[PDB]
Amino acid sequence: MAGNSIGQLFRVTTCGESHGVGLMAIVDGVPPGLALTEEDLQKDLDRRKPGTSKFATQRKEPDQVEIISGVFEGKTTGTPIGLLIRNTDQKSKRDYRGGGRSSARETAMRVAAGAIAKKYLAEKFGVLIRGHVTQIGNEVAEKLDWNEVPNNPFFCGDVDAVPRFEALVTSLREQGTSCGAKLEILAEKVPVGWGEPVFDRLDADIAHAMMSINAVKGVEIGDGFAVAGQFGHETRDELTSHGFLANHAGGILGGISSGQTIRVAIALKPTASITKGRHDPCVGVRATPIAEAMLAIVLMDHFLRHRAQNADVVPPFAPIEP
Amino acid sequence: MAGNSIGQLFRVTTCGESHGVGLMAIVDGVPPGLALTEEDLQKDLDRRKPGTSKFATQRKEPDQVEIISGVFEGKTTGTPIGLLIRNTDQKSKRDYRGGGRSSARETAMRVAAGAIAKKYLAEKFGVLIRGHVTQIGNEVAEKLDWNEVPNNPFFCGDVDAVPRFEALVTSLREQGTSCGAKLEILAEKVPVGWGEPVFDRLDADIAHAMMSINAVKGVEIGDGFAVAGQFGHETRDELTSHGFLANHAGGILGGISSGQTIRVAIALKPTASITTTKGRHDPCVGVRATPIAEAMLAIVLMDHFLRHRAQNADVVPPFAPIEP
C-alpha cells in the first residue's frame, strides 16, 4: 500500500490516491532561507506536459500545487514543508462520473519535491540537473545541444533526430504499438565527497531512487553496462596517453562523488493501451522531468548527510558560484 | 566513514577495517527456530575464491566467522544475531598491527548475513538464489547448466565457454590487464506480492543493494536495457502468439514480485592495481563477486518477505509445524 518515504535527512513523505480527494507530501530538512513559491514548483510540474497546447483535444487548467507550510515571506523557514494538490475531478461543490485514476499524479508529489532540492543545489552549489532522451525503440539521437531539448516534445537534444523520433511515434500511434526508451540524466558541478558506504552510496541511492519510476528495467552510472566489455586501465607509468577525466565512473567512484559530472541512464520498457484514445506510444519520454527530481532528491539528501558529518570544512576553494 | 546498516525489518549493521582488529555484524529480524551454525555461514563465505586450492597449490585456512549471539542449541532464538571475525594478518618479512587493506574482507559480513536470509528463505519457501557469470571482457556464455557452474572458476554455466574464459584470463594475466564482467543472479520460487512501492519497490531495493558491491556500474531487471529498443506489441488478449508468458519483467511487475523467477544482472568494471608485489593479478575480480551479489539479493528479499507478512492481517493459513 506504500513505502511512502524516501530520504533520510532530506526526506520526502507522500500520500494520495488519484481517485482520492487530493495529493500531499511533507518534505524535510530544507535549510532556511531559500527563495520558494508555488510557481517555482509548478514549472517543474508542468514540464511533464511538453507543448503550449500540443496534445489531446481540449485544454485544462491544469491543477495547481499549494505550499501549506514551511516558507515565510517567500523563503523557506527550515521547518517541514507541506505540499498539497487538491485533485479536481469534475465533481466538487443520476449519471455523474467516477471510477479511478488518470494519474500523471502518481508523480506529482515527487516532482514538486525534487523541484525544491533542484533549486537549492543550483542556488548554493550551482548544480545543474537535466536529462534528455537518447533512444526510442529503434531510433537513437547522437548529438547533444541543451538549448534544443525544450524545443521538441521528446526532450531530445539532437535536432537531426527530432524528426526521426517524430516520424516513429507517429507510426506507432496509428499502428497501435508502443516502444521502449532510454534517458540520460546529468548532474553537473556536484561537490566531491557525497555518498555513504558501504550500503548507502550515492549511486546505490540514485539507482534505488530511479527505480521508483515505473517501467524502468535498468539503471547504470557512467559507461554503464558497456563496462563488462572493457579492458582495464586508468593509470600506468607511460609517455603518452588519453586523459582520465573522460568519465568512465560517471561522477561516482567507490560510492563517493568525484566532482566530475554525474551521468546516469535509465531504460523504460514498453507500456500498454487500456480502454476513447490517446495512445501513448512511448509515454516514457515523460519520465525525464521526473528522472530529474529523483536524482535531485538523492543529491540533496547526501548533501545534508555530508554536511552533517563536519565541524568546519576543509578545502577546496574552487570556482565559486551561488 | 559508513552508512553501515541496511534493511528495515531484516536489518544488517556492520563495522570493521580489513587492516583492523576484526569485523562485526548485528543481524535483525530473523524468526526463531531456524537451524544455524558457523559452518552454515562459512560455506557461503568460502565460496568467494573458487576451487579447492587451485591458486598456488595450497590453502592456509581462511579466517573464521563466529556466531556471538542469537542462536541457542543450534536454533535461532529470534534475538539479534551477532557475527564476528577476528582478522589474523601477519607482518611476516598480540595480532597487531594493521595496515593491510584487502578488498576481500570488505564483503564477508554481507555474505555471512546473506547466508542466513538465503538459508531461511530456502526452507520456508523453497527459494533458490543463484548467480552465474555471463561475460568476461569480450567473451560470452549462452548455455546455462547450473551443475556446470561450480566445476570451474568464473562461476560460468557454459562448459564450452569455460576454456574461452580461461583463454582470455590466462592471456590477460600475462599482459597485466584486467577486464569488466557481467553477472546474472536468479531467485527462484519467490512468492508473488513482495515489494513496496512508491519508494521501496522490490526492484528498487535490489538495485540499491547490487550497487553496494564495488565495481558495479549498473543494475538491470528482466530484459533490462534491451527493453529500450523493444516494441510492446502485445495483443494483450493472448491471441495466438509465442512468448505470452516469458519473463520480460524478470519477475517484478509494477515493483511487486510476480511469482516468476527473479532475474537480475549487474556489470562490474575492470579493476585498478598498485604495487611497486608483482605476480598476483586479478585479472578479473568481478567474477568473485557472484556470492556477494547473491547475499545482497537474499538480504533484500528476506527484508521484503517480512515487510509483506507484516503488512498482512488476514493471512493465508499453513500449519505444518508443532512445538514442545
XYZ file of C-alpha atoms in Angstrom, chain B:
324
model
C 33.107 6.618 7.229
C 29.938 4.496 6.821
C 26.268 4.042 6.019
C 26.524 0.843 7.859
C 23.116 -0.523 8.016
C 20.594 -1.940 5.638
C 17.162 -3.460 5.773
C 14.191 -2.287 7.651
C 12.729 -5.317 9.275
C 15.544 -7.717 8.362
C 18.402 -5.384 9.142
C 22.117 -5.769 8.967
C 24.542 -3.424 10.727
C 28.285 -3.879 10.206
C 31.684 -2.468 11.175
C 35.400 -3.210 10.864
C 38.507 -2.497 8.806
C 40.414 -5.141 6.855
C 43.675 -3.985 8.340
C 41.632 -3.708 11.523
C 41.331 -5.936 14.580
C 38.168 -7.703 13.346
C 34.788 -7.409 11.583
C 31.307 -7.419 13.127
C 27.659 -7.645 12.232
C 24.412 -7.464 14.093
C 21.624 -9.068 12.071
C 17.963 -8.374 12.930
C 14.519 -9.799 12.309
C 15.347 -13.459 11.726
C 12.479 -15.618 13.149
C 13.217 -18.213 15.834
C 13.577 -21.948 15.256
C 15.947 -21.853 12.313
C 18.768 -24.400 12.456
C 22.023 -22.457 12.301
C 25.746 -22.789 12.982
C 29.054 -21.226 11.895
C 29.771 -23.655 9.063
C 26.326 -22.808 7.640
C 27.784 -19.341 7.034
C 31.364 -20.432 6.309
C 30.143 -22.455 3.299
C 28.849 -19.296 1.619
C 31.826 -17.307 2.934
C 34.415 -19.606 1.450
C 32.803 -19.591 -1.983
C 34.447 -16.319 -2.785
C 37.662 -17.873 -4.051
C 36.574 -20.978 -6.123
C 38.191 -24.421 -6.330
C 39.845 -26.472 -3.580
C 43.279 -24.857 -3.657
C 43.587 -24.065 -7.332
C 45.562 -20.959 -6.643
C 49.258 -21.660 -5.981
C 48.712 -25.296 -4.894
C 47.700 -24.741 -1.273
C 45.455 -23.125 1.285
C 46.035 -21.545 4.615
C 42.636 -21.724 6.237
C 40.616 -18.643 5.697
C 39.615 -16.526 8.669
C 36.651 -17.772 10.658
C 33.222 -16.345 11.468
C 31.786 -16.785 14.964
C 28.124 -16.554 15.975
C 28.189 -14.447 19.096
C 24.546 -14.330 19.907
C 21.145 -15.171 18.622
C 21.479 -18.903 18.378
C 20.926 -21.290 21.208
C 21.153 -25.017 20.878
C 21.626 -24.928 17.226
C 18.473 -22.968 16.652
C 17.859 -19.242 16.165
C 16.412 -17.671 19.298
C 14.843 -14.829 17.367
C 17.031 -12.215 19.038
C 19.619 -10.081 17.205
C 22.222 -12.432 15.710
C 25.769 -11.174 16.224
C 28.651 -12.275 13.994
C 32.416 -11.884 14.434
C 35.663 -12.453 12.558
C 38.984 -11.659 14.147
C 41.421 -10.862 11.369
C 44.694 -12.602 11.637
C 47.014 -10.559 9.496
C 50.712 -11.450 9.604
C 53.585 -8.976 9.302
C 55.894 -11.703 8.002
C 59.014 -10.244 6.387
C 49.004 -9.884 20.101
C 47.830 -9.874 16.475
C 48.996 -6.287 15.819
C 49.291 -4.421 13.724
C 47.064 -3.381 10.809
C 47.896 -1.642 7.539
C 46.849 -4.360 5.119
C 43.723 -3.331 3.238
C 42.340 -6.322 1.298
C 39.302 -5.627 -0.778
C 38.012 -9.148 0.026
C 37.461 -8.691 3.803
C 35.115 -5.813 2.861
C 32.409 -8.330 1.785
C 32.500 -11.046 4.478
C 29.761 -9.595 6.711
C 27.177 -9.168 3.934
C 27.911 -12.663 2.622
C 27.731 -14.048 6.139
C 24.499 -12.175 6.850
C 23.180 -13.015 3.369
C 23.681 -16.708 4.066
C 21.115 -16.519 6.881
C 18.459 -14.950 4.582
C 19.330 -17.473 1.898
C 19.022 -20.410 4.256
C 15.778 -19.249 5.859
C 14.173 -18.493 2.520
C 15.208 -21.890 1.114
C 13.459 -23.663 3.881
C 10.452 -21.636 4.219
C 9.563 -21.290 0.614
C 11.983 -23.220 -1.478
C 13.701 -20.183 -2.776
C 16.992 -20.626 -4.631
C 19.202 -17.594 -5.171
C 21.910 -18.370 -7.720
C 24.365 -16.153 -9.521
C 26.493 -17.086 -12.547
C 28.873 -15.142 -14.816
C 27.882 -14.451 -18.429
C 30.672 -12.284 -19.786
C 34.301 -11.529 -19.077
C 35.842 -8.972 -21.384
C 34.785 -9.920 -24.907
C 33.842 -13.495 -24.073
C 30.236 -14.511 -23.525
C 28.405 -17.666 -22.459
C 24.975 -18.536 -23.852
C 24.279 -22.015 -22.455
C 23.435 -22.395 -18.772
C 23.938 -25.639 -16.854
C 23.820 -24.986 -13.132
C 25.758 -28.192 -12.490
C 28.450 -26.703 -14.699
C 28.837 -23.571 -12.616
C 30.761 -24.826 -9.582
C 33.059 -27.018 -11.720
C 35.172 -24.107 -12.911
C 36.313 -20.802 -11.615
C 34.407 -17.874 -13.264
C 31.112 -19.274 -11.861
C 30.309 -19.915 -15.539
C 27.374 -22.037 -16.651
C 28.529 -22.742 -20.215
C 31.006 -25.628 -20.437
C 32.141 -24.844 -23.905
C 32.780 -21.250 -22.876
C 34.824 -22.109 -19.802
C 38.015 -22.636 -21.877
C 37.442 -19.357 -23.731
C 37.295 -17.570 -20.362
C 40.457 -19.393 -19.290
C 41.996 -18.451 -22.579
C 41.261 -14.762 -22.066
C 42.192 -14.772 -18.395
C 45.396 -16.850 -18.734
C 46.279 -14.481 -21.588
C 45.448 -11.268 -19.754
C 47.409 -12.195 -16.636
C 50.467 -12.266 -18.870
C 49.794 -8.881 -20.330
C 48.997 -7.338 -16.957
C 45.476 -6.378 -17.882
C 42.052 -6.872 -16.425
C 38.536 -6.923 -17.848
C 34.965 -5.972 -16.996
C 32.273 -8.537 -16.146
C 28.594 -9.437 -16.359
C 26.739 -11.470 -13.726
C 23.213 -12.801 -13.699
C 21.592 -13.705 -10.395
C 18.312 -15.579 -10.267
C 15.989 -16.056 -7.347
C 13.508 -18.896 -7.974
C 10.281 -19.739 -6.157
C 9.846 -16.275 -4.634
C 6.124 -15.804 -3.838
C 4.061 -13.184 -5.676
C 3.408 -9.994 -3.659
C 6.704 -8.785 -2.157
C 7.811 -5.212 -2.869
C 6.675 -1.915 -1.567
C 6.006 0.909 -3.919
C 6.361 4.020 -4.266
C 9.877 4.275 -2.911
C 10.612 0.775 -1.698
C 9.713 -1.297 -4.747
C 11.479 -4.593 -4.656
C 13.294 -3.722 -7.772
C 14.468 -0.515 -6.185
C 15.849 -2.128 -3.095
C 17.563 -4.816 -5.154
C 19.206 -2.194 -7.415
C 20.345 -0.355 -4.262
C 21.994 -3.439 -2.796
C 23.568 -4.621 -6.015
C 25.173 -1.177 -6.195
C 26.873 -1.863 -2.831
C 29.429 -4.112 -4.404
C 32.486 -2.422 -5.602
C 32.843 -2.004 -9.394
C 29.173 -2.380 -10.114
C 28.290 0.169 -12.832
C 24.709 -0.734 -13.476
C 21.844 -2.961 -12.470
C 19.065 -4.251 -14.703
C 15.987 -6.365 -14.161
C 14.236 -8.567 -16.696
C 15.371 -7.945 -20.263
C 16.898 -4.784 -18.845
C 18.405 -2.184 -21.149
C 17.338 -4.146 -24.281
C 13.957 -3.048 -23.206
C 14.812 0.345 -24.570
C 14.720 -0.962 -28.120
C 11.728 -3.291 -27.869
C 8.241 -2.565 -29.022
C 5.422 -3.618 -26.869
C 3.488 -5.447 -29.407
C 1.308 -7.392 -27.068
C -2.122 -8.306 -28.224
C -2.860 -8.092 -24.528
C -5.527 -10.601 -25.450
C -3.127 -13.531 -25.551
C -4.298 -14.122 -29.103
C -2.319 -16.897 -30.700
C 1.301 -15.864 -30.133
C 4.689 -17.063 -28.798
C 6.044 -15.619 -25.585
C 2.732 -14.983 -23.861
C 4.478 -15.962 -20.624
C 8.094 -15.042 -20.847
C 9.843 -13.162 -18.152
C 10.483 -9.936 -19.833
C 9.858 -8.433 -16.491
C 12.339 -10.673 -14.779
C 9.816 -11.416 -12.057
C 8.953 -7.940 -10.903
C 5.920 -6.071 -12.204
C 4.939 -2.629 -11.008
C 7.559 -3.001 -8.325
C 5.994 -6.086 -6.758
C 7.087 -9.705 -7.324
C 5.160 -11.625 -9.992
C 5.768 -15.180 -8.855
C 8.112 -15.806 -11.790
C 11.790 -16.290 -11.299
C 13.510 -13.024 -10.474
C 16.359 -12.260 -12.836
C 18.914 -9.555 -12.217
C 22.149 -8.628 -13.891
C 24.839 -6.219 -12.778
C 28.015 -5.309 -14.593
C 31.359 -4.958 -12.851
C 34.234 -2.884 -14.306
C 37.923 -3.594 -14.884
C 39.772 -3.117 -11.599
C 42.773 -0.993 -10.672
C 46.129 -2.313 -9.348
C 49.041 -0.777 -7.372
C 52.251 -2.386 -6.166
C 55.793 -1.302 -6.887
C 54.244 -7.447 -5.279
C 54.085 -8.481 -8.909
C 52.622 -11.862 -9.723
C 49.077 -11.940 -8.471
C 46.700 -10.454 -10.882
C 43.068 -10.356 -10.589
C 42.870 -10.167 -13.519
C 39.164 -10.313 -13.374
C 37.964 -9.898 -9.815
C 34.414 -9.255 -10.998
C 33.676 -12.991 -11.144
C 34.365 -13.421 -7.404
C 31.507 -11.011 -6.663
C 28.958 -13.690 -7.508
C 28.319 -14.986 -3.968
C 28.211 -11.390 -2.738
C 25.695 -10.462 -5.407
C 23.803 -13.467 -4.115
C 23.860 -12.390 -0.477
C 22.561 -8.962 -1.451
C 19.706 -10.404 -3.374
C 18.795 -12.581 -0.376
C 19.160 -9.785 2.216
C 16.772 -7.626 0.244
C 14.314 -10.437 -0.475
C 14.367 -11.511 3.209
C 13.617 -7.958 4.345
C 10.725 -7.730 1.883
C 9.232 -11.050 2.859
C 8.927 -9.849 6.455
C 7.561 -6.491 5.337
C 4.917 -8.242 3.313
C 3.954 -10.582 6.038
C 3.914 -7.658 8.487
C 1.617 -5.730 6.125
C -0.908 -8.552 6.088
C -3.642 -9.010 8.632
C -5.902 -11.671 7.212
C -3.105 -14.108 6.382
C -3.411 -17.292 4.336
C -3.003 -20.298 6.626
C -0.449 -23.110 6.646
C 0.076 -25.287 9.744
C 2.864 -27.793 9.067
C 4.657 -27.467 12.431
C 4.425 -28.084 16.209
C 6.479 -27.193 19.334
C 7.080 -28.547 22.880
